[PDB]
Design a protein. Structure first.
Lengths: 54, 55, 53
């Protein structure tokens, strides 16, 4: 309503973008800790299985 | 003045339409990301030098 | 994302615009003080009949 005192979409959208950035930071920190792109089976299943077998 | 009251009735329907389109747009963004990933998978599998167990 | 959207939508439906109520409130307080003075003015009618007798 642009004057509503019960809600505001700006805060929700700002929250969503902040959480997106936090998830990206999680991924990069994982990449740094392990030293490789595909560490677990969640990153990429096909390539992970291939590397294990190889 | 009856007409001004009716305009007050119209604005809510316009707002409801906006809301439905936002829900659709969110779902659409998710769908486009999934389609990109599917293209990547299909492209990777189109390789003829691949093992039988990776396909 | 969906829960945020639903909350925002419900608020869009049933939220007020306080800026309009402030103006309306000021106007109504002035109008009520005025209506009281008007009623008090109207009450004192018929008080002049005594002077006739």
């Amino acid at each position: 309503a642009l004057n509503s005192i019960n809600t505001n979409a700006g805060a929700m959208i700002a929250l969503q973008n902040l959480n997106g950035t936090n998830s990206e930071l999680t991924t990069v920190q994982q990449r740094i800790n392990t030293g490789k792109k595909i560490a677990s089976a969640k990153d990429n299943g096909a390539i992970w299985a291939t590397a294990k077998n190889q | 003045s009856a007409t001004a009251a009716s305009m007050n009735a119209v604005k809510d329907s316009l707002q409801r339409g906006q809301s439905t389109i936002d829900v659709a747009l969110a779902a659409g963004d998710t769908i486009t990301d999934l389609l990109g990933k599917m293209k990547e998978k299909a492209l990777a599998a189109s390789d003829t030098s691949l093992n039988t167990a990776s396909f | 994302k969906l829960q945020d959207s639903l909350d925002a939508g419900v608020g869009n439906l049933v939220d007020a615009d306080l800026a309009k109520e402030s103006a309306k409130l000021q106007s109504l307080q002035t109008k009520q003080q005025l209506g009281v003075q008007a009623l008090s003015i109207a009450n004192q009618s018929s008080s002049s009949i005594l002077s006739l007798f």
